[PDB]
UniProtKB/Swiss-Prot annotation:
Belongs to the protein kinase superfamily. CMGC Ser/Thr protein kinase family. MAP kinase subfamily. It comes from Homo sapiens. This is Mitogen-activated protein kinase 1. Changing Y177A: Inhibits interaction with TPR. The TXY motif contains the threonine and tyrosine residues whose phosphorylation activates the MAP kinases.
Amino acid sequence: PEMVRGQVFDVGPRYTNLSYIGEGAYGMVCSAYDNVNKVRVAIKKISPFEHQTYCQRTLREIKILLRFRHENIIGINDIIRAPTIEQMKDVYIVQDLMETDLYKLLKTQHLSNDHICYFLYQILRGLKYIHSANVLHRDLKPSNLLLNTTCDLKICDFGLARVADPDHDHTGFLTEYVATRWYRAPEIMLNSKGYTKSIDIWSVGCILAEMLSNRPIFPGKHYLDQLNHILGILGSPSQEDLNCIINLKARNYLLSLPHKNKVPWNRLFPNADSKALDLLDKMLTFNPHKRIEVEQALAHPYLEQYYDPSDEPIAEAPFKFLDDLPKEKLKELIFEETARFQPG
Ligand SMILES: O=C1NCc2ccc(-c3nc(NC4CCOCC4)ncc3Cl)cc21
């Protein structure tokens, strides 16, 4: 088998001529040449079988991506794994190879307002489909938005995705959370498990802000510092917004803070389109109940040159309610879920 950086990367003979890209916390991503459909492709090595939570996230991701078909969402082209459960130590997911991601682009390139608009349109178009399937991405951030040489955009990394569960969203104050800190909505730190669609809208708002200045808008250094940053721009929550936080610890924390004034969006982003700032304001609304939804965002005047609901598809087959299964049963389900890609 092909070797890369002291790891077997066992994907031949269909897939040859490998180069390293990067690596997540339990597997490496490479590019490779696909000898059947004569193009280079991206391949992710996943090694989840020692741990139940890694099994759960691998299974969820595979199930979601195999169900989804959308121009603004990365698909699965192929899955490679051993012919038997016994021999199966790793799974490789083959996906379209993209040129770059929005994190890399923002570190190097000024975006014109027309690029911002197009990127934001595509993000929201992909997100409309995801949300229409009753799925939350839960880790939207620039590095999970892939781009090609003509600026087509695809959302990737459904490793933290979940089926939406708004009636079980409530939790206590300072409850630990998995998703990337700088893109976390204020309510995660206060009283939310991140099981409602509004969690994703907040992240998109953070992305839009970052496209406007090339800098993250709320770069907290740790859990409660993230809320310090959010409130330093939005200002103190209104009485009405506090009344929706019934949990006393969270409410009393907010009440304990000195008054903070809102920083006007046009002072933070003096070169921005006024319509982009109006949409930004509605995405970065403190109260998740008042936060704009994806379909409203699409219909916003900023996006009027692209908006076309007949060309913003929804999912044919949304998901419903698989968390007490042990890792051995989860291996059998991953083996079952990947069986369509085998020879035979
Ligand atoms: O799902 C994921 N999590 C971690 C990751 C890394 C990379 C990819 C990925 N990258 C690329 N192209 C790179 C090329 C160099 O510039 C950055 C983008 N193309 C397809 C995929 Cl599927 C997907 C994931």
